Amino acid sequence: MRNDGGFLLWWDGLRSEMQPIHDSQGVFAVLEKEVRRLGFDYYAYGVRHTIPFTRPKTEVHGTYPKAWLERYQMQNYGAVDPAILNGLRSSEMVVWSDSLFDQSRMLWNEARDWGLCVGATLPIRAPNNLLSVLSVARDQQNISSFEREEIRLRLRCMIELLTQKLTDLEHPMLMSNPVCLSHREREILQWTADGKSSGEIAIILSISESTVNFHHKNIQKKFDAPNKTLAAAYAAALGLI
Amino acid sequence: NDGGFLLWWDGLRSEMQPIHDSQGVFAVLEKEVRRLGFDYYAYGVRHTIPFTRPKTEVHGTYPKAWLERYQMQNYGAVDPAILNGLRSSEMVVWSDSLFDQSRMLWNEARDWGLCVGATLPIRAPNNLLSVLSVARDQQNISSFEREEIRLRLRCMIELLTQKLTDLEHPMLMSNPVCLSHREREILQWTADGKSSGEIAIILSISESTVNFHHKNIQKKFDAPNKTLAAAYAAALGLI
Amino acid sequence: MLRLSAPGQLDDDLCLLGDVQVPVFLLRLGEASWALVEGGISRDAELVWADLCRWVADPSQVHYWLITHKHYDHCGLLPYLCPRLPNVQVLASERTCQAWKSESAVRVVERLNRQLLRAEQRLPEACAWDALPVRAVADGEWLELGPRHRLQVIEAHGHSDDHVVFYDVRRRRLFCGDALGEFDEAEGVWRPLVFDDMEAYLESLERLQRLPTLLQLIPGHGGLLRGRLAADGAESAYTECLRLCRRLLWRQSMGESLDELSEELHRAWGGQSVDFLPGELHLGSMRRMLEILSRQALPLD
Amino acid sequence: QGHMLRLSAPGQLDDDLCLLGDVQVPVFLLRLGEASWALVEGGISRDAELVWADLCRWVADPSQVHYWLITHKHYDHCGLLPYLCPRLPNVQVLASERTCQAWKSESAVRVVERLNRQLLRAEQRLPEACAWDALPVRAVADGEWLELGPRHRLQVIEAHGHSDDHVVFYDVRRRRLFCGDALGEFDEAEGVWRPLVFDDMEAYLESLERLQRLPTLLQLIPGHGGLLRGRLAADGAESAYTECLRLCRRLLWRQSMGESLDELSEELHRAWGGQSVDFLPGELHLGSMRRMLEILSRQALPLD
Ligand SMILES: CCCC(=O)N[C@H]1CCOC1=O
Ligand SMILES: CCCC(=O)N[C@H]1CCOC1=O
Ligand SMILES: [Fe+3]
Ligand SMILES: [Fe+3]
Ligand SMILES: [Fe+3]
Ligand SMILES: [Fe+3]
């Protein structure tokens, strides 16, 4: 590499610098280096899962003050944090602003107290329907528009490559829930999630109904589910069917 | 002072925001595609349901006969360039190895001159799979242009999906279903494995009311049971 | 090397005809189809037709002639060679054609071209200006010149009120004329040539930065540039234009006149364009550029 | 005050800032309070008796000089310390740990002493001097806040590149930046920056990058030439970056034609050396040109 001569040079340098990395800590380290190269003090990377639908998991990892992470998870501010929730509705970057936080005033006041006075947040959706988010923050300088665009671009590149490398390294934060379905079980679940009954699946797949119900039992066992509704819903949410 | 690419980005944004009709958006897309050096482009939207026969709508500038053939043989189902987006967000350069599983599609596309090309996937904020392809006939993709392209295509598909959603295009539209907070919360609980009685207990209402709400939801989804309703709601990002 | 500079074939498809100072460019669209770019001067027709003979077997297969703008060093061959390529469509911006239609502009161009002949050279045949095979083109118009030549036109006002440039998208090759300036052969940087409007000049350089990364950059003087020089050509031209702006404004803040820097710039630069530009006109053009800059430059506090 | 864009005259420069000595190698004086003062830049040795005189016009007591900020180790920015610190009992010299330890390395102090001793006026009589390792020094770090005075809170910023120890001082209240040679030598005749890369070009450019990010500057004070103001000081860092890359391109082009480093060194000397004849022997200026050209040829990005 990340250098000066052109943006494409920085892109290729970042790629080559990140290719040999076999440890997630070093990946985050390169990310932090480039973030500070951009001009901000702290950064953060958040993963919002789709389930449980009532209380969806929102994991976070970054370089905000650890006391702020204590408070953030203690009061579970991550549930209704506008910077993250924007990604459910837009592919655009979000620059932190008072108007944005009119809904969650306590979180914004506490973040300002911890120095997170200026910042921005970029969301993206992984190909497995996860909501990944990359936030940057500093204390004293507001974001101008030209820097807004510069950031938007560089952060997009960085979060894309980061999610790619973290999927390649099978990080626990992104692993969500490791579940593998067999071809037979996956197609049976595809048919069930389309509304077909056990007997209709038995007819279609040219197998017995006892076999189909035993496959349902196995599938429920994998999802730790009590019935087929939970299994089908979580599979649809996780992109397994 | 931070890259001449920013000039192109801001120019594209300024050119595409004042447009209030999708025709002009696609026209600007073709403008930039041809400016890069390719002949044709395409934009595809793969929906998540039906899981067995997923909808794959398309709009672009390939020969109309080739699209007729494409939909006739439902190539949208097992098109590798599209299916890459289900498991990866990285760009795909067209190559024989990519099409070894669907050789007929690749052979016919080559017959149509679509000999060189690439396809970039992205996930809309509504669990839809959008994809942007570019293609030419005679010149293979060089390396530095490979990366430059990749970046430009990423930017363009991002802004295109944004502007088309803002323009409420039918290709991006999905099955229109609206749930109230109460019924949506009931479905959230059901899709989490709760039974009728457990939901009635939690929401402090009767079980007859909960089963009547289940009937309402299935009636809207044209569903035979609650499994289909829950699965389609999860797939559509409604819960 | 890093700079190509010689008459003849540039790459697998193109040729540079005539003088590298006032060169013409030849596109081989197909087996039996050719096109031209830049109108050059009258002083080089005697070199044109001949050196052309080495590459083209039949002159009748020239179908297009592209002109960047109306300056004498990029247009003065219409009387010389146009009559003998009957199936040729000159393609030019409305400004350029209308200038060709005016008597005063053609008189200026004819005088400036006459100022460059040799005491032995005799003038070949000539034709009229309003009788040219002209066709108006527009900004962004796509020229399907050949099966492997799809070039787009881009309006690059600034150096003049009509300058336009051509981008081959397939080879990422940009013919820019003077919109970027005069390439310094000794130092490797750009010399601004703002002779009409500075804001239009800078905005044109911007719009050109929006193109894909360039592999080949072809101005009106010097030849062809490859590698980094072609990539950041517009960026560097913009930077050097602003550098000259700053120099002029600083010198003016110390109580110095435009004449000072005009004479200095003549001394330091005119040596490059002595073969195709009377020195007095070089000084006058330096002064014109400095006046435009002093008029449109951003002040200081 | 003044309408001008560059203040280059000994005397008062601002409500709290004065320039002392020769404008070529100035020493800047800050009034922290009624009886508290601070110095910036170390200047050259032969100006000792001059600076002192000027200093005494402003400060009624030398004991009120409490701090002395130094940018880097080069001879032309710390030659006054050994001669004038004995007269400033209450002074703390503030410099980077690399600079502070340089004042301990026999060889570096010998180089400093030789180069400063070579710039005397015929029969100049140096005043007594104290040891370099005896100076009242307190090392500083990157990003430290120096609580000089109630209305003087200056931040330290690492500006490596020009040297392996260069640092700069940002008075954030007044958006004032003492930048030393981190941007280079200002061309008084043309209004542009002359790159002064004498250690590492990557670090030089990265430091100029980081400095571009500071709040818009109102006062830009390099080690030579005085004080810049207005738009000239606002975009100083970006302009230095641009001029450095311009010289890079020029060097690379001249090499693509088959030139040597020393040809362009001679050219750059003939074009620039005239400004620093009073405080820099010509041979050392030519050597610095050759060294910067070496570093640029090594670390510049080729053209292929
Ligand atoms: C996952 C990203 C969340 C994030 O950046 N939150 C910021 C917003 C303001 O205070 C915070 O903690
Ligand atoms: C949705 C777009 C998919 C696409 O353009 N695929 C390409 C691969 C080769 O022939 C095609 O049709
Ligand atoms: Fe011209
Ligand atoms: Fe010209
Ligand atoms: Fe120095
Ligand atoms: Fe110095």
Numbering used by the authors:
A (entry chain C): 1 to 241
B (entry chain D): 3 to 241
C (entry chain B): 1 to 301
D (entry chain A): -2 to 301
Text lifted from the article:
Here we show that PqsE and RhlR form a 2:2 protein complex that, together with RhlR agonist N-butanoyl-L-homoserine lactone (C4-HSL), solubilizes RhlR and thereby renders the otherwise insoluble transcription factor active. In common with many other gram-negative bacteria, two QS circuits use N-acyl-L-homoserine lactones (HSLs) as autoinducers, namely N-(3-oxododecanoyl)-L-HSL (3-oxo-C12-HSL) and N-butanoyl-L-HSL (C4-HSL), which are produced by autoinducer synthases LasI and RhlI and activate the LuxR-type transcription factors LasR and RhlR, respectively.
The homoserine lactone moiety of C4-HSL establishes a hydrogen bond with the side chain of W68, whereas the amide group engages into hydrogen bonds with Y64, D81 and S135. The complex is only pseudo-symmetric, i.e. the twofold axes of the PqsE and RhlR proteins are slightly shifted and skewed relative to each other. To validate their relevance, we introduced alanine mutations and investigated their impact on complex formation in E. coli coexpression experiments as well as on pyocyanin production in P. aeruginosa. Notably, only the N-terminus of PqsE is accessible in the complex, explaining why tagging at other termini abrogates complex formation.
